From a paper:
The B. anthracis BaTIE and the 86 kDa E. faecium EfmTIE86 proteins are predicted to comprise a Class II TED as well as three and five CnaB‐type isopeptide domains (IPDs), respectively. SaTIE‐TED and EfmTIE86‐TED crystal structures were determined using Se‐SAD phasing and standard refinement procedures. Continuous electron density between Cys and Gln side‐chains either previously shown or predicted to form thioesters (SaTIE‐TED: Cys296 + Gln467,5 EfmTIE86‐TED: Cys88 + Gln292) confirmed the presence of these bonds. Despite pairwise identities of 18–23%, all three Class II TEDs in this study display very similar tertiary structures.
An increasing number of surface‐associated proteins identified in Gram‐positive bacteria are characterized by intramolecular cross‐links in structurally conserved thioester, isopeptide, and ester domains (TIE proteins). TEDs are predicted at the distal end of a large number of surface proteins from Gram‐positive bacteria, and the name TIE (thioester, isopeptide, ester) proteins have been introduced for this family. Internal thioester bonds, formed between Cys and Gln side‐chains and first identified in the second thioester domain (TED) of the Streptococcus pyogenes minor pilin Cpa,3 play a negligible role in protein stability, but are suggested to mediate covalent bacterial adhesion. Structures of Bacillus anthracis, vancomycin‐resistant Staphylococcus aureus, and vancomycin‐resistant Enterococcus faecium TEDs show a head domain with Class I topology extended by a β‐sandwich; the latter contributes the thioester bond‐forming Gln via a β‐hairpin insertion into the head domain.
Author numbering: 1 to 34, 35A, 36 to 184, 185A, 186 to 280
Write the structure that this text describes.
């Protein structure tokens, strides 16, 4: 199995949406019983929601903050928090009564995943919100958290090239292969042995490829002249795909660190394939 190389972002800029809350819960912190966990909703400059990693630092927004430099790649738990939390899932789907509750429930998951406090420290009540409000938040939290901790989905890029059929056609030995991926993009073929003279590559529509590039979720055909001495050819593909993964950014000990889904590129190899032919 191959390992994909995800291109890392270098920085991110965050903007307040205007949504804020004093929180629907409190936390027994080590020196501070029933400490409030207030928050401001923010987005990165491409309009994707950011979540706070540090409960005791201010939001990473305004002229002071500026851009936050890249810190690291978010775990599968953080990936799932985004996929199974707000706004990827609606308030109704999460059991939250409105979008503020759904968002805060997700931020609560973020704080716990980042290690700010344990679930046993959460006080499920707040003086400015009713028990029913807090309980919807609790229900949403538990759904999202359970999925983040125990769900199976990851940002993994699947990529394969698989031989489907072979045939002699006209003046060529032909070898057809199927490409497959769960991400959009294309693949580049690299030949790992000598290429026979007069070798050609064709796309699924029968049109010649001359830039060694193939489509994903498609097919292509390699053609080797029947005049070629008996032997073998080996190759692989390297997919170049678009992928949306969670990344963390550095608040520099002044603003909170923040995690956000960013669309970037990834390269990933297929397995090694061989075409074999015998000269008539």
């Amino acid at each position: 199995g191959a390992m994909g190389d995800v291109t890392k972002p270098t920085s991110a800029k965050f903007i307040e949406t205007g949504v804020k809350t004093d929180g629907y819960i409190r936390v027994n912190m080590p020196n501070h019983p029933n400490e409030w966990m207030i928050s401001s909703q923010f987005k990165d400059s491409h309009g994707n929601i950011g979540y706070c990693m540090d409960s005791e630092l201010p939001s990473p927004t305004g002229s002071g903050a500026g851009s936050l430099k890249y810190k690291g790649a978010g775990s599968d738990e953080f990936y799932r928090m985004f996929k199974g939390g707000f706004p990827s899932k609606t308030a109704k789907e999460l059991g939250a009564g409105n979008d503020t509750e759904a968002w805060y429930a997700t931020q609560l998951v973020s704080w716990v995943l980042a290690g700010n406090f344990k679930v046993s420290q959460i006080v499920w009540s707040h003086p400015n919100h009713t028990a029913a409000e807090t309980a919807r938040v609790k229900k949403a939290f538990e759904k999202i958290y359970d999925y983040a901790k125990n769900g199976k989905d990851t940002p993994n890029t699947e990529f394969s090239i698989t031989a489907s059929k072979t045939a002699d056609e006209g003046k060529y030995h032909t070898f057809t292969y199927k490409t497959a991926s769960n991400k959009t993009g294309n693949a580049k073929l690299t030949f790992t042995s000598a290429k026979p003279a007069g070798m050609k590559i064709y796309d699924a529509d029968g049109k010649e490829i001359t830039n060694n590039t193939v489509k994903l979720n498609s097919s292509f055909t390699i053609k080797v002249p029947v005049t070629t001495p008996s032997g073998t050819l080996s190759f692989k593909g390297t997919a170049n795909v678009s992928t949306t993964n969670p990344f963390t950014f550095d608040g520099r000990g002044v603003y909170q660190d923040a995690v956000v889904m960013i669309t970037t590129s990834e390269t990933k190899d297929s397995k090694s394939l061989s075409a074999k032919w015998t000269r008539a």
